[PDB]
Design a protein around this ligand. Structure first.
Ligand SMILES: CN(C)c1ccc(C(=C2C=CC(=[N+](C)C)C=C2)c2ccccc2)cc1
Lengths: 186, 186
């Protein structure tokens, strides 16, 4: 495909190289497309990267549902969710491009005007595991929406900041956290 | 001193033009030094940066050594050390050039090794608080280095990926965590 081969090279590029490293034209380069082709299908290079994000945030979000069954209670759901984060082939990999990019276009408004959309689209997995855990009476989270953002960013931290050490340790550290956290809640 | 002048001019040059944008031609000329002199001391711009990053963390450890006097107990030290990390990373000038570096030499393993050695001096802070807490019995954690890494990573993730909120509410979020966390230990 045309437009489905652009995202195809852009994704990986942002990852390998970072947000700035990859260029509006460099993509058009390894994708064989016409510099113009971009404009009507993809507004700006930041719109394309803003696009790929929602795809990844989606791909993962689905893969998550299809697996979370293996977790019967939500307490397990919570552990499982965080565990799987470390291993998914989605979103999480291009997490520095996220950093680079928010600290680079943060002096504009098209940011929080298309960012928080993805933020909320993310802290949502935690929204449901907690709120559900209230219904199931697995605990009493009085400000769920908050706890969701904490948990999600504390977790995004453990995943992003340890990427380069033995995967069985990340999984160990991550479980010990999932624990301490759930624990401080009840 | 000539070694100092270089470190000095560079810290600025980076703060003002970022990492990739700064040439050693500049670090050399603006510090009335020698290109060979530079090579002898740091070999590369990468280290030159890693070296700044080290002098810096050194100060922070010390700025925090006189700051923890406001915290009687170790429960309090943990609350404050986290908040200090949140507040100061806000107006920290170099912050932008660290991100630049990190998401560039993230992949290189040569650099990635010296990094961790550095991410550790930042982790000892926790190490100490936790251990002391043990001795005074504020809590009874018995895998300090693990808890320490988990805390250092959850916290730095709240800092790094919460950016969008109004500073007043990020400081709100951080303490809620410090509490949930501190709770689940006990
Ligand atoms: C200005 N300031 C107080 C600080 C500035 C930076 C850090 C960081 C960091 C993240 C995880 C670490 N761990 C837990 C290994 C250690 C350091 C860090 C932040 C952004 C990109 C890479 C590393 C911490 C404090």
């Amino acid at each position: 495909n045309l437009k489905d081969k652009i995202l195809g090279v852009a994704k990986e590029l942002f990852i390998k190289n970072g947000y700035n490293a990859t260029t509006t034209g460099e993509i058009v380069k390894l994708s064989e497309s016409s510099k113009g082709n971009l404009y009507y299908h993809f507004k700006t290079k930041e719109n394309l990267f803003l696009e790929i994000l929602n795809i990844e945030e989606s791909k993962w979000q689905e893969q998550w549902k299809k697996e979370q069954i293996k977790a019967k209670t939500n307490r397990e759901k919570f552990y499982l969710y965080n565990e799987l984060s470390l291993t998914t082939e989605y979103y999480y990999p291009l997490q520095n491009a996220i950093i680079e990019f928010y600290t680079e276009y943060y002096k504009t408004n098209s940011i929080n005007e298309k960012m928080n959309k993805l933020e909320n689209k993310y802290i949502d997995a935690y929204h449901v595991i907690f709120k559900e855990g209230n219904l199931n009476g697995e605990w009493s989270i009085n400000d769920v929406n908050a706890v969701s953002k904490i948990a999600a960013n504390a977790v995004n931290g453990i995943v992003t900041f340890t990427h380069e050490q033995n995967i069985n340790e990340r999984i160990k550290l991550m479980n010990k956290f999932s624990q301490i956290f759930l624990n401080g809640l009840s």
